Amino acid sequence: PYSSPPTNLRSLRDRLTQVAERQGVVFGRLQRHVAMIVVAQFAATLTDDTGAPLLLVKGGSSLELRRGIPDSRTSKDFDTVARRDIELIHEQLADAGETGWEGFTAIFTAPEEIDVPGMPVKPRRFTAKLSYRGRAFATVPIEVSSVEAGNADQFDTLTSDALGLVGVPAAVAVPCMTIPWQIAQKLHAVTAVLEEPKVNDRAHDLVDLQLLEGLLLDADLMPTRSACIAIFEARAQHPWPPRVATLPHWPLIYAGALEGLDHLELARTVDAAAQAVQRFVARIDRAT
């Protein structure tokens, strides 16, 4: 029961060590979750002049927020979508970082762009260098993409009590892309055919797509169908509905992506994962 925040970086890490052992989790994982939460709190301070989020969390960080550390893949990336524009995001986050949150501060590396076919405006990558009460704490790779169709019309707001458990009580509340659009974008990515020297390595999306299907539960799959149509049309690459092929090097990638998830009811082989996701494609495609 911590009565006050950690005094310095050394005390922070001792508490994280204690919580990680209490919860049966690897320290490095809890530590990197905390760093993503800190970054997310900076991003949640970014609003338009109505108070609406400028940045929505997506990708593996989002799944780790939705499912919890035990029930999600280890994510290294903090992926986000910018609701309004992307060049103003970098300077707004750096101000957020300098201003700080609960003792944490951040400095952000310069934004490099990326070529992605199908996206007129290009994603950006940079890095957050986090400090606690002066002493460097962790580094978080950040990617920012522009909005595509209605993938930023709405957002879910997710939380974590990880910082509470080490005596940082401030509320955590993170705006995230909704599940229909996460499914649409991961379905597109895992079935994408890459340019000759490039090769699709995204077998891990087969894990995430099973985890996201579990979370739609019995919901109408019609918002997910409309999101899939929109993404696949917006990107103007392979058509909807796609075929979930597996590539020759994917078996071990998929196995690597299953690490730590033995307790979940997931396909245990990449073939069965492809079969599971294909059935999910067909179910989404029948939802009118």
Numbering used by the authors: 4 to 291
What does the report in the manuscript say about this coordinate set?
The Mycobacterium tuberculosis NTase toxin family, MenT, modifies tRNAs to block translation. MenT toxin activity can be stringently regulated by diverse MenA antitoxins. MenT and AbiEii toxins share four highly conserved NTase motifs scattered throughout their structures, proposed to facilitate co-ordination of metals (motifs I and II), base stacking, and transfer of nucleotides to tRNA isoacceptors (motif III), and to contribute to catalysis (motif IV). Our study reveals a conserved mechanism for the control of tuberculosis toxins, and demonstrates how active site auto-phosphorylation can regulate the activity of widespread NTases.
Recent characterization of the MenAT1 and MenAT3 TA systems found that MenA1 binds asymmetrically to two MenT1 toxin protomers to form a stable heterotrimeric complex in vitro, whereas MenA3 appears to function as a kinase, phosphorylating MenT3 at the highly conserved catalytic S786,21. We first sought to establish whether phosphorylation of MenT3 S78 results in steric occlusion of the conserved NTase cavity, as had been observed for MenT1 and MenT1-p. Structural alignment of respective protein backbones returned an RMSD of 0.144 Å (268 atoms), and there was some small movement of the S78 loop, leading to occlusion of the active site by the phosphoserine (SEP), albeit to a lesser extent than we observed for MenT1-p. Using the solved crystal structure of MenT3 as a starting model, we performed MD simulations of ATP and Mg2+ binding in the absence and presence of MenA3 to establish whether a conformational change to the S78-bearing loop ensued. In the absence of antitoxin, R76 and K79 stabilize the γ-phosphate of ATP, which lies 10.0 Å from the sidechain of S78. This arrangement closely resembles the protein-ligand interactions observed for the MenT1-ATP pose. H207 and K189 interact with the β-phosphate, whilst R205 directly interacts with the α-phosphate, and the only non-phosphate interaction is formed between the ribose 2′ OH and R238. When docked to the Alphafold-predicted MenA3:MenT3 heterodimer used to run the simulations (pTM score 0.84), the looped region of MenA3 connecting α5-β4, spanning residues H98-I108, forces MenT3 S78 into an inwards-facing conformation akin to binding of MenA1 to MenT1. As a result, the overall distance between S78 and the terminal phosphate of ATP is reduced to 3.1 Å. We therefore conclude that regulation of MenT1 and MenT3 NTases occurs by antitoxin-induced toxin auto-phosphorylation.
